[PDB]
Every structure is written in C-alpha cells, then in structure tokens.
Design an enzyme around this catalytic site. Structure first.
Site, PDB file in Angstrom:
ATOM      1  N   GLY D  48       0.822  -1.196   0.000  1.00 33.93           N
ATOM      2  CA  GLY D  48       0.000   0.000   0.000  1.00 33.93           C
ATOM      3  C   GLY D  48       0.864   1.258   0.000  1.00 33.93           C
ATOM      4  CG  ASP D  53       8.085   9.452  -1.270  1.00 33.86           C
ATOM      5  OD1 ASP D  53       8.400   9.698  -2.456  1.00 33.86           O
ATOM      6  OD2 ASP D  53       8.477   8.446  -0.639  1.00 33.86           O
ATOM      7  CG  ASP D  67      -1.667  -3.819   0.981  1.00 33.02           C
ATOM      8  OD1 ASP D  67      -1.873  -3.522  -0.220  1.00 33.02           O
ATOM      9  OD2 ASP D  67      -0.631  -4.376   1.380  1.00 33.02           O
ATOM     10  CD  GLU D 133     -23.459 -10.221  -4.363  1.00 31.81           C
ATOM     11  OE1 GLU D 133     -22.745 -11.051  -4.959  1.00 31.81           O
ATOM     12  OE2 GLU D 133     -23.880 -10.394  -3.201  1.00 31.81           O
TER      13      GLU D 133
END
Ligand SMILES: OC[C@H]1O[C@H](O)[C@H](O)[C@@H](O)[C@H]1O
Ligand SMILES: OC[C@H]1O[C@H](O)[C@H](O)[C@@H](O)[C@H]1O
Ligand SMILES: OC[C@H]1O[C@H](O)[C@H](O)[C@@H](O)[C@H]1O
Ligand code: NA
Ligand code: NA
Ligand code: NA
Lengths: 721, 721, 228, 246
Positions: D48, D53, D67, D133
């Site tokens: 993740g 930066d 994550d 769904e």
C-alpha cells in the site's frame, strides 16, 4: 524483600516499591514490567506476538517475533527494530551489532562507572550484571541495574568492551531505555532559559519523537537531564509517574518516541551529537549513570522520591543534612568595583545583621577589572584586596564570618598571561578565528596538561588559605571543537572534557571536604545531578527578582532538594527585571530556598538593616524546616497562575508561604489547604495564637487575606502541640 | 462520633466522613464547612467580611456584612443577596421574606416529608431541626438535615408553615443549597435522550448559571436529578466530589451559579416552572428529600457512596440484596401480535433455556391491538389470552416460571371506555384541543377520584391473581395544564400529580410486598431516586442494542446500583439501531446489568437456543457478583472511546467484561489493569487456569486480545484461592 | 511581478503570492521574511540585536550579533548557533565549517539536482544561486531557491563542492530550513501506520524538538515527508 | 519490506552511503523505464502506502494508497492520502465483504462511494458474485465514468473530516458545471438531529439542480443554509448528492 533475583528466564531488579522484570528470550532481553512490586510474575501483560506488516524477523520462518514489536531495555538498529536506537557501534564495514545475552551475575554494594559521578551509600544495594556479546564483532556489552532498599529508584549504566583485534567506534550509547505499553501518556520536563531556568513543561505524548537535548558542552539553562512519563491526568497528589534522569553535566539527550503501533520508548544518555568514542583492542567505555524513579502519588510523590534519593545517595553525606550558612555575596552589590575598605565595611554590616558567611565574588584575581580579561590568571590582586588574601581572610574571620571565594577554572581570556603562555590550551579549530562568549574562551579540559595545571593551582589556593566555601562558576558554552589530532579525537573531546572536570572536582571536593562548594553557570546553566554529586548547592539563577524567582524555584526544587537551591535577597529595582518588589516578599521568596543576601548593605537605611536583621533571625528558625523538612507545593506558579504557595513540614513545625503576583479587586479570597498533617493534631498559628486541627487546615483551609497591591506575600507558621 | 451536635453558635451535622457545619450569626445561617469531618472547628476558611461594591446590608452602618457575599444554606431574594434564590413566598403585596433562625432541635430515628419518598432504615440517624421565622409575614420555615452512620450522605428537606391569617403562595422552594468557596470546579451530570439515557456530561464551571431541569411532569430521559461538583482534575480514583441528588420523579431543577466574586452556588429541588403552592392559614408544605454525598476517592468513590446509600436507605429492603429473576419479555418479540398459543410456546422455550420469569407486556387489556386505544381499560382480553388471566397464570406457573405483567396506570386513550365514561379525568385545558403523544393522554392524578379508581382497579388486579412481578410503564409527558378551578390550583396540579402517584405506588408496593415492581417510562424516562424508593429495578432504556447500551449502562449505574439496571438480550438486526451484533456481545453487555431476554425464542435455531441456555447458566453464576458485588469502571464508553470495560468484585470472585466497538488494525493491544484486589492474593483465571497475583493484575494488567471485527467482547473470570 | 531580484544586500525570491527575502550581512545570510509578497522591504520585523546570555559571537567586541539569535536559512554547529544544524561536514580534525556568502547569480528555466526527482515545466521560473565558501576548509556550498509564476511554492536544494586536496565527509545536509519568529504555532503532519496510512496529526508547538523521520530506507507507512 | 543489515560497503563510509546510493539507483531505474515507456501508466506501491511521497510521484502518477480496502477504514486514509496530493493519484478499490483487513461487513453502495472519492478500481472475484451484485457493479462503473472528470480533474473540498473522533465524513468536488458531494456515517445514531451539511465555493447567484429530486437551489442556499442529511438506521451508510449548475 529487595535486591536482585534470577528465576529461570526472569530477572527481578527489586528496589523499594519499584521492580524491573526482564526476560531472557533466546539471547533477546524483553522488558516485561517496570512499576510497582510484583513477585511470581506470570506475564499477564506480555506482548501478543503476531505478524506486523514491515516488522521483520531474525529468522525466515517465524513472522510473529520482531524486534520492531517487542518491549526492550536497549535498542539496536538494523535487526528489524526501527525505533530510535540507544547503542550503535561501528566495526569493520558496518554499524550493525547483534548483542545477545550470555550470562547474568549479581553484585552487592558499591558499584559504578570509573571517572563519572555515581551513587554513594550503596551498602544495601545489589546490582544485576547482564553480559551480552556480539560474537561476530567480538564485542561485549554489559548492562548494570542497581537496587536501593530505601527509595523507589533503580540506577543503570553500561560497559562496552572491544575484544576484537581492530579499532571500533561508538556512535550512540545511552544510559537507560524503556519500552512502555501503548496507553495515553503525558510528559513533564524542566526547560526554560537563562534567567528562566527549569521552567516546568507538560504536554501530551504524540506520534513521532519528542526530545530535549544539549549540544552546548554543559547540560544548559534551557533543558535539564530529566524526563517524566506520566499516567494521563496525573495531579500533584495522584497517578503514576516515571522519572528518568542522568548523572551527567555535559551533552545529553532525553527522548520519547511513540511509534506506528502506539508503543512508547523513552531513553536518556550522552547526546549522539558531538560524540564518538574510539576503542582500540581491549579498551572499554562506560556510560554515565541513569536513574529511573517511580511514584504512584502523583507529581508531589515523584518530587519526594527524587529529592530523597538525591539527599541519601547523591549529595555529599558531609552536607546533605547540614544547615547551610546564610551568606552575603558582593556581586550584584559592587560588581568589579570594590577594594579592601568596601569589602570589610560590607563584612561589618553583614555581621551586624547576623549573616554567617562572606563570599568574595568575581574580580579579585589577575587583571580582572571587567569581564574582558584575566580568566586563567588565578593570582591574587593584592593591590585591590589591600594585601594578601590571607590578610583579607583573617580580617573576615575576626569579624566572625566564614570566608568564601568565586572561581571560574574552566575558562581562559585571550587577554591573560595564561593565554599568552599557552594559546593552544583553549578549545579551538586550527585556522578558524575564535568564537567568543562574554569575551572569553573555554579551556580544553580534555588536555591532561590543562587538568594537571588546574589541579595544582587550585590545590595550592585551598591549602594555603582558610577558605570555608567556593563558588565555582562557568560562564559560557563550548564552540569550535577541533583540538584532536584526528577527527575522532575531536569527537571525543567533549566527553573527555567532562571526564577532566569530574577528575578535577572530585579530587578537590574530596581533598578539601570541609569546604562547602556551590556550583554555578551563569546561574543554573549546569544544574544537574552530575554536578550535585560534588557540589551540595547551586546558584539556581542569576535572576534574583522575587517574582521571577517563583517559576524558577518551582522547577529548581522539582526533582532536587530545597537545600540545594541558592536564593538571594537582592536590591530594587531588580537588576534583571527592572521591577520594584517589597523587601518582605524578596525575603519570603528567598526563604523558600537556601538563603543568602546579594546587595550593598552599606547603602541601606537603618530601617532596611533592621528588616534584614529580622529576616535573618526568622530564617535561623525556619532553616531546619526549609532545608531539612518535607516540601509540599500548594499553588504552582505556572505560566497562567497569579499565585504561588509552598508548605514545609519538619517534626512539630509547619510553615506556609503565599505570594500573589498581581493585585486583584472584587475577587473572593483564595482558600489554601495544607497537606500531610495529623487530622487529630492541634496546630497553633503563631500570628494569632489560634489552635486548629490538622483536619480543619487540610479540609477547610485558610482564607488568604491581602491588602491591595502587586507582589504581596505572607507566611503562616504553625506549631503542633 | 456521628450524629448532630449544637455547640454555642455552631451546628455540626456529622455523617460518616461527611460534616456540614453551620453557624448562627444573629439569625442568619452561614455555611462554614461541607466536606470531610472536622471537630472543634475554629473558622480558618471563614469569609473575610469587607465592603463589596453593590453588595448591600441589613443595617445602615455596617457595609461589610452582606447576604450577597456570605456562604449560606438557603437563598432569599430582596435582602441584598442577588444569587439565585431557593425559597420565595408571596404574601400580601410582596414576595420578600426574611426568615431568621429562632431555635434548633435534634431528632433521633425515622423522619421525613409525608407523602414523598424518603430514606428508610433510619434507626442510627439524627436530624438537625432549624426553626426559622419571618415575624412580619408570620411564616415558619423549618430546615432538616439528617446524618447517616454508615454512609457519607446527608439528607435534607424543609417545611413551610403559614401561621398568618391570609393565604400565601410558594413560588420557589428547593430541597438543598450550598455556597462553595471560589475555586476551580468541574461538574458532572447525567443527561442524554430517549434511547440515549443518562449520558455522562462533564464540563468546567463558568461565570453565569448552568442548569438542567425537567418541565415534562416526569424527571425525563434527557436529565437526571443529580449534579456532581468536582475538584478540578478529578479522576475515577482521586479527588473530591460532592453529589447532590433529589428523591423526586416530577419536575426538578439543578443549577450551578458562579457569581461576580467567583463564588459557586449549587441547588436542587422542585422546578419553579409549572409550580406554585397555595397555603391557607395553618397549612404547611414539605419539599422532597435532597441528598448530598461526598467522596475524596474520585468518580468511582462517589459512585460507590451513592450506590451504597441507595442500597441501604432507599431501595426496598425486601429487594436490595435479593437476586433478581432472569426474565423473558415478549414486547420486542411479538409487539401487539400474540395470543395464548404463542405465549405458552414462548414460555416453553424460556423454561428450556432456564429463564425464571415470564413477563406479558403491552396488549393484554381492553381493545389494545395497537398503541392507538384502550389505555384506561384494565380489563383482561380473555379472547386474546384464550381464557382468564388466572388460567394463563396457572399455565405459566405449571411450566415452572414466575409470572409478570405490564401496566400503564397513569394513562388514558381517547378511544377507551374510561375516556367515554370520564373525559374530564384527562389532564386538559377547557376550550383547547388535546395535545397528543403516542396518541394517548395523561390521567389527572391530582384528582383524588382518579387515584381512588386506580387504587381500586389495581388492588383488585393484584389480589385476584398470583402475579409475581409488575412492569409499570408511563409513555408520555404532561401537556395542557388547566384542570384547576383556579390558576393557582393548576399551578399545583403537577406536584399534586406526583403526590397522587406516590400515594398510589407506595400503597400498592407495600400492600403487595412480595411482587417485584419494575419501573419504566419508554425505558429510562423517569429513572430517579423517587421511583427507586418503591421500584427496585428499572427498564434502563428501550434501546437494547449491545453497543448503544454501553454509554447508557455507564450512566444508568453511575449513581444507581447495578441491581437496579434492567438489560435484555434482544434480536438482530437491532430494532433501534439497525445493527448486527454478536450474540456473545449482546450477552456480555446485558450481564453487566440485571439480565433478561426480549426476543422470540420460538424463531431461534437450535444453536442459538443452546447459546442462550449457556448464557443463562453463566449468569446464574455471575448474578451474585454483578448484583451484589462492587462495580469498578476500568474503561469508560464516553463519546470518544472505542472500548468499554467493567469489573465486579464479590468475595472470592472477580470478573471483567471488555468490549471493543470498531475493529482496529496495526494497533498495539490495550493493557487492562484490574482494581481493588489483594496485592498478595492469588487469582486463578478460569479460561487458562493461570494463577496471577493481585499485584500483577493491578499493576501490570492483561494484554487484551481480539480477532478482527466490530462489536467483539470478552470476559475474564477469576477466583481468589 | 515574479522571479528573482537582487537589490543591494537583499535577495527577493518571488513566487506567486509567496516571497522569501534574504539579507546578506557581511557573509551571513539572514531570513528576513517568508510569507505573503512584500516589495521594497524595509525590515519592520528585523531581529532586535542584543546581548543574549550564553549566545556567543564571531568577534570579541560585539556581544549583540549572535548566530544563536539571528533567523537563518541554513544551520551550522560550532559558531555560536546551538539550534539543530542542517549542514555538517567533517574535514581534517573537525566538523566545524564556516560558510560565508561570496556571490549571487540568477538562472532562468530548467534547473535541479542530477539523479534526484525535481520539478518539471520550469520555463517560467527563475532560480537564486547563493554561492557560499569556507575558505579555510576549501569547500563551496551553493544554495538554490526557485520561483514559480503559477503557484505559491518555492523549491530549494544545495550543492556541496570539495575544492580541497583531501577527502571530506558530509554528516548532515538537509534540503530546506527556515527560522520563524517567536509566536504560537501548531503543526500538522501525516503519520499513521500500515493499513492506517497518512493519519492527519495536529499538535501545539512546544519548547524542545519534535521530529518525524524514517530510518527504514523508504519514506515509510508511518510518516510522510511533510510538515505544516 | 524495509532495509536492514547495512554492510555492503568495502568501507564503513561506503556502507553509510549505500542507503542514499540505493535511492539514486532506484531513481536511475524508474526514470529510465517510465521515460522510455512513456505510454505505460505506472502505479507505485509499497504494501500500500509505505512509500507514498513526492519523490515517487515524480515518476508514478498514481499510488496504491493502502492495502486496507475497507470502506470505513479508508475514510481517514483517503483524508490523509489526498491532503497534500491530488485525488487523481489516490488508488481506491471496491473489495469483498467481510473485509479482509478489518473483518467487517459494509454496504456495497458505501464501498462504491468511498472508492469513488479516489481513483476507482475493483479488487474482488467478480465470478463469485450474484447477478444482482454484478448489476450493482455495472451501475457503479457507469456512475463513475460520469463522475471521473469531476473527481480526478476537479477541485476537492473537505466538508466533514474523518478524524479520530468524528462519526462522519463528507467530501465535495467541483468541476465546471458539476458539483458532487459524498456523505458517509460510520455508526448508526438515534434520537439525534440530522447533520446540516453546507457546500463550498459555489456561485451565490448560481442555480444548482439536484439530480435526485430535480429541485433547483441557489448556491447561496447550499453554502449558507446547507442540506439536511437524512439516513435510515444502520452502520456505514452513505449518500451522494449530484448537482448541475444551470
Ligand atoms: O562574573 C560574576 C558573575 O558570574 C555569573 O553571572 C554568576 O552566575 C554570577 O552569580 C556572578 O558570580
Ligand atoms: O408499549 C409497550 C412498550 O412501552 C414502552 O416503550 C416500554 O419502555 C417498552 O419496554 C414496552 O413495554
Ligand atoms: O504480494 C501482492 C500484494 O503485495 C502488497 O501487499 C500490495 O500492496 C498488494 O496490493 C498486493 O499487490
Ligand atoms: Na563513579
Ligand atoms: Na416519606
Ligand atoms: Na532531477
């Protein structure tokens, strides 16, 4: 039962009401518990081992054991722990070490680093000796934890041995570290500034790293080597406090880090800045002593624990329970402009008001008519003193006064015969101009010739004269580090300086054990437990304003006993603040400390003299209570408060001093409750003769009445019947 | 030594560890001290008498004595005191009184206002009787202060006599007031809302007036008759707390006023709103009982003091230490849609899981197929119950269950035979339409015919049926006040209503002293110490969500014992919050209270039934610890916390329940420390068999481990060996 | 008007709505103003020079000029400033340097460190080039400050040249520093943890040193290279 | 993972240099590759957001923010992740329930709306989904294709911050004639007045048509009076308001 116990894989370091319990886990040392006494510890509060992302492991297959997530007692970098490290040693191509526990021993009695201030009166102590080794690097790291049977304090330090056949370099080596469980904490520190020493700061612990530190070569005016980790919501009377403190007077760092998981690491030791330490084969390095002290009785509780420990195991036994003389010091009184006549007239007036000791301050030596020359030339100016120092001393003794003298041994002026004879003795960098401070330079006490010279000059001064007291000043910080023959020797010179100072002062104070030595550094620029090991009092601050002294004295006695804390009645308007204060208030404020006088008694009216004589008579009475008694803060002079109040109990005597800073109007009187009395005790108030039960005084309290005006004060004196 | 003492001009009201010391000063009564025990009080904390601008005087020549500046125990308006008054009586052309102290008496034993709930078990009490008179108005005001030998509580109330030959009108008459010295204070109250009862509020005392109050005719969901004045920075374990509370279930007010001088007045009593009281010659008026309780052991200390006092001197002795039955209640289970078959099937399943009591809720009477009719018609619907209530009860008894029944006696539906026979019995204003609430009206219990009817109907219900338990509900607040023959009689009707209710419930609960009565008002709309005098448990909240219950139970047991606090395992998704919670968590949360079940057991799986049977078996074990034991809050579910934890100690048993609201990740486990254990005690943890010292559990604590997920809980069960 | 201007002893680094104004004072570079645009700056907010105890001096006779008390744009240790340093270079037997300003240039357009990520689209930028030297150590330190015409941002970096005949070692070399006047401040940072990244933290500035940092070889989950 | 055991230098000094040299090597590598293959979209990742930066964002125009793909846990993460960095950078995926990190059930609608305050993707096994769904997912994708310019190219306004104490989050995006607002409530509440939610940076005199009800509101009304926010009973509920300036 107190002392050290080793039970299977647990080590129990047991001081009075304070236990450190460490587990050896396959070479790794885990902090299991630090706090109130636990016997037969099972591990209710053990770290739950699980896979934490990016927290790495000593083996391939076990993801749940990580030095990033275990609570420890020392910190390394490069093995998976990413918290701030406390030991870091360069060897060969790396500064990765992996010190593993090999063996434990227990010592009894006296124990401490050579050449650094350490606890005394250690008959009833035991020390846990944890021997660690990095077999690859061939280094030993030995941790020591010492118990005390009469205080909730544990002392710690380490020794690093180079057993390899190559040079190694210590980059970081702190004296104590502890990993505390995730929880809400606050920290209390003593910071401030020159003329604002030991300002009490309190704040919440936040994610990231908070630090106080000195890179000045002295602990400094603006930070004290202390850090108090406190239970959320601690008060004066309630909650858990852990104080970590350093017996060191040079560069230090104290930090609190709260990491990604909310865990909290605290550590104190020599500052990594301006420090490296070369070790040739078979050489070793010992860190200064750190102390960890505990109370569950809040901030007053930690004060008492810390004060008690200082009094019994740090401050010189010769002085720790000895009433200190009421002195006159001429500094604010005359500055540099004095001679024999003036001095003996001051001395006459001091005796008339009942002062006990006369201190001759700066300006008696060499060419010292101002602060621009002569430091380094510890030669008596007979012209100015109107004869020999012997003749002046006899003169003072005959007037019935003890005799004291100011020195500044660590310093050298460019304009001095010392500098003309030995310009290389000054701390300096070749090919750089000096950096100046109060137009003076610092002597390189890392140079053994410098230490030998100062030992000799000062030993001669003390053996040849009947001096009762020494004020040892130190009026600047260290710049331009470059006296090493190598960069590494320069990196070592700041700590070597401290070793040289401690060699010097331990020698002198021990050899002349009847002289009361008072430490000084432009007031409280070096007021730490390193200095207090040899100097049983300290000039708390150059700020002698009665009102400005309130927060200073609050901080100055926070962890240190009142007996240490020099405080002088000075002239008005005050020289630092430009302020008029009542003489009564200057009196009462100074009498919450170790009382002296610092003003020109010869220029006082007959009335002012009478008042001073009365103050001296009062304090002779209060002196045992203040200096020997137990201190209770009742109202704190913090940044917002308009008031200060401090109580002292000593046997049948209880006194309370109240000060109000600004005049108020149409405001109900403060109710001031006393602490730590016998509920059923009967307490007779001197001023009105009324007798009050301790219950009344603690639970109802005193309506505090003052006239209109700024900086008014009063004192309540009680005798238990 | 405890009780009442009269020494010269001082009166000492001495409960265990709590003293009220009053001085008679020429007819004026001054509050000298309220707090920890003081004997031989001198007056260290006396108000300093001086001229305060605009603070006026009873005489021309003495400007320093002002009722604006003296600390007092009751407040009048118009004599110079401008603080909020607590007694105000209209007579002739004025509502200025000037009650002056005339005489003191002391009573022993039982004592209290007639027709209002007051303390019982008063054998070891004494009562100070302070007789005051306004000679001009010809009125007497008598203050009563009662000591308790076994609790840090003092009880108070007053009696106002009209000795004149004209009618007078009481406008304000509170039950307790105290003037506390200027200092920093915080206040804690219990507020909240329907389905959010007893939300614990804490705030700083500020200049001005803060109040909580009910004008609803019942104490209400949103405020409790309690106010805690706390030392700055009080915690669970440390600091001074004064709780003032009212034994009254109608309109009340509690206030804190901080005036111009920083002084602080607190008072509690009948709300001035919706209240006036006519007194003809020779009539009198007595206020409800107020309580002032003290601890210096922080918020847990005040909880314990208040709980203890309730258990011993308020809650019915027949029940205060009697384990309460685990019940099933059908309300959430079926609402209005039930009949005999359904009920007895529910009863069968309840017995199988080991439930003890079966409560038939709303809908069994008159035409009550929904909430739009039939209130007032307490006639058994035999068609719906499939025969007589006698036959149903026998059926339930034969299945081995106690039998309970819901009533709402204070209410009348427009669509009811009661309303058709007596439309004037409803609280109403002539010529105004009704205000409706849950489509029902309130009965005028100020009407003696209404009280007589309800006494008769209900006495008949209880004498003719073997009912083991009553749930007494009350589902709306009072509007449209206008049943008086005069405005004054209307102003009186809200308090007269309360007198009628107390006449009713005291009669019934006393006559049928074997029935357990549980009070209710849409849950906790009237959960106060007035009701708890007659009803030993209360339906704490209609919100039966396990997570929403956390702050509710926190407040509901804050001043009231856990045994009072009804809590039911209910269905998911929860009917109030729309939330799925683990059955385990619904179980553990309800078991921190007085456990029952409120869901359709017949629609449960075999597994769910087994779980329920296990929960019931567990609680039968925990029930003595929870209901009879001592409660310790360890982590509070306040507005910000993600956790709750509550400990109970009872002899050799210690249990701890931990709940986490939201799932967390990469967050170190909470460390949970237990309280009030033997340091040297050995505590065996049932789940793992490990034995821990009390020291370990209190000072190191438990690493609390949970899986990933919301609303998870666990319980730790310990036995001291 | 935006870009770089050099007027007598003042240097003006002017981005849109953001100015950095630096004064050359006998080789020492003083931070005069960082904030909203000011032209024709006079010095209303200048540090009042006085004798501060234990704050030392480059010369014997002037006690009022101290690098301990002046607001600066880079920090050295050992010349009297005891604040945390941002450049520290070992040479010979010391890590004392004394970099003094010698010369300023202005560049236009693209400019940045080689081999490190730097801004693009720099056509409408100018860069102030401040050339400093320690003559004794024979080292050059060059500071760069870049303006942007379309954002209230200034970019900075430095270049350290070894012009001596011996090896030297850089121990500390930060990319930007500013001394802000005494006042009440708060700080906001982005911290947190794995699966809790960039948690917004706000706190009061207190006496002492607060830091966030990574020693992980990557900036990390638990701290972002940002401070507000 | 993070870097341990530094000791590859031929000297201590070369080891002290190796961490920064590592970064120089990485930047040489990624600048080369991203520049040589300038049509490939590179997304940076480090378990993740372990390296999210401005150094990486120079070469990688989006980043896997975390994550943690829980819709509720994402609220504070996205708050911080877009605090100094543009929304377009901030990868966010609709994932399965119970959530793999938090052990939590969240409404698919809420997983949708939260991810659509970022750079939208999907990370669950579509083959194991019901037909319903799938339909919901197809609708979410159609919605975001519409919102995508507003979210990715538009101006972000935080209205309610998901800080450590708040029970709510609300973020507004403006892009030309389009204004959208997403509101999320973490825990169900009861007997609590509805939140009043004021929009920012609108034309006072502008007329703003609310898609769901067709009502037209002046910008002044929306900024100064605001929307009464209505939700059913339940945890982790969300709604979106879509406005078109006429
Ligand atoms: O120079 C003399 C002077 O030195 C320092 O400032 C000391 O702290 C003062 O008390 C005084 O001794
Ligand atoms: O109407 C029946 C219903 O009435 C109130 O809401 C009560 O608090 C509930 O427990 C239930 O008894
Ligand atoms: O190992 C695969 C896995 O690696 C890291 O955890 C990433 O952040 C995830 O998105 C996934 O790509
Ligand atoms: Na020693
Ligand atoms: Na009664
Ligand atoms: Na570049």
């Amino acid at each position: 039962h107190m002392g050290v116990r080793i039970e299977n894989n647990l080590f129990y370091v047991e001081s009075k009401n304070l236990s450190l319990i460490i587990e050896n886990r396959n070479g790794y040392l885990l902090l299991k518990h630090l706090g109130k006494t636990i016997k037969n510890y099972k591990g209710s509060n053990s770290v739950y081992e699980r896979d934490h992302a990016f927290s790495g492991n000593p083996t391939a297959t076990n993801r749940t054991f990580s030095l990033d997530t275990q609570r420890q007692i020392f910190g390394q970098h490069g093995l998976g722990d990413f918290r701030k490290p406390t030991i870091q040693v360069q060897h060969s191509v790396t500064e990765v070490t992996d010190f593993r526990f090999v063996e434990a021993k227990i010592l009894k009695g006296q124990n401490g680093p050579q050449g650094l201030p350490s606890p005394h009166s250690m008959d009833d102590t035991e020390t846990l000796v944890l021997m660690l080794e990095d077999s690859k690097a061939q280094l030993s790291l030995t941790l020591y934890y010492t118990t005390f049977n009469n205080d909730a304090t544990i002392a710690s330090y380490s020794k690093l041995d180079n057993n390899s056949n190559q040079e190694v370099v210590i980059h970081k080596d702190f004296s104590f570290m502890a990993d505390f469980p995730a929880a809400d904490y606050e920290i209390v520190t003593l910071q401030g500034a020159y003329a604002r020493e030991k300002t009490v700061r309190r704040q919440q612990v936040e994610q990231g790293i908070f630090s106080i530190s000195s890179n000045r070569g002295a602990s400094g005016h603006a930070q004290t080597p202390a850090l108090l980790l406190c239970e959320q919501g601690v008060t004066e009377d309630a909650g858990n406090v852990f104080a970590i403190q350093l017996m060191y007077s040079g560069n230090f760092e104290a930090f609190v880090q709260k990491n990604q998981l909310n865990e909290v690491r605290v550590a104190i030791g020599i500052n990594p800045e301006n420090f490296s330490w070369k070790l040739a084969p078979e050489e070793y390095f010992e860190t200064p002593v750190a102390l960890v002290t505990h109370s569950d009785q809040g901030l007053t509780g930690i004060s008492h624990e810390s004060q008690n420990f200082v009094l019994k195991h740090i401050m010189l036994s010769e002085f720790s329970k000895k009433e200190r003389p009421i002195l006159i010091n001429n500094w604010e009184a005359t500055y540099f402009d004095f001679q024999r006549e003036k001095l003996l007239e001051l001395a006459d007036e001091a005796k008339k008001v009942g002062i006990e000791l006369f201190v001759l301050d700066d300006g008696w030596f060499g060419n010292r008519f101002d602060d621009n020359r002569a430091l380094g030339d510890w030669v008596v100016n007979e012209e100015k003193l109107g004869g020999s120092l012997e003749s002046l001393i006899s003169a003072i003794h005959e007037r019935g006064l003890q005799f004291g003298l100011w020195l500044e041994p660590e310093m050298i002026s460019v304009d001095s015969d010392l500098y003309r004879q030995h310009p290389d003795w000054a701390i300096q960098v070749p090919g750089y101009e000096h950096t100046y401070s109060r137009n003076q330079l610092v002597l390189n006490l890392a140079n053994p010739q410098v230490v030998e010279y100062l030992k000799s000059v000062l030993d001669q001064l003390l053996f040849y004269h009947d001096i009762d007291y020494i004020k040892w000043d130190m009026n600047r910080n260290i710049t331009k580090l470059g006296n090493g023959l190598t960069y590494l020797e320069t990196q070592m010179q700041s700590h070597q300086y401290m070793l040289g100072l401690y060699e010097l002062v331990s020698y002198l104070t021990e050899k002349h054990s009847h002289i009361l030595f008072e430490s000084c550094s432009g007031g409280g620029g070096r007021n730490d437990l390193g200095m207090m090991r040899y100097f049983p009092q300290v000039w708390a601050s150059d700020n002698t304003d009665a009102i400005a002294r309130l927060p200073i004295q609050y901080g100055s006695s926070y962890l240190y006993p009142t007996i240490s804390m020099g405080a002088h009645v000075s002239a008005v308007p005050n020289h630092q603040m430009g302020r008029m204060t009542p003489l009564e208030t200057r009196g009462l404020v100074a009498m919450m400390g170790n009382l002296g006088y610092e003003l020109d008694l010869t220029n006082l009216s007959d009335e002012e003299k009478a008042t001073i004589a009365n103050q001296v008579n009062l304090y002779k009475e209060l002196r045992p209570v203040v200096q020997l008694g137990q201190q209770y803060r009742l109202i704190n002079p913090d940044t917002v408060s308009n008031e200060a109040a401090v109580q002292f109990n000593y046997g049948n005597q209880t006194i309370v001093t109240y000060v109000r800073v600004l005049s108020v109007v149409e405001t109900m009187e403060t109710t001031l409750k006393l602490k730590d009395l016998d509920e059923e005790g009967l307490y007779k108030l001197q001023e009105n003769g009324e007798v009050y039960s301790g219950a009344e005084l603690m639970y109802a309290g005193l309506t505090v009445i003052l006239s209109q005006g700024d900086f008014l004060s009063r004192q309540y004196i009680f005798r238990k019947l």
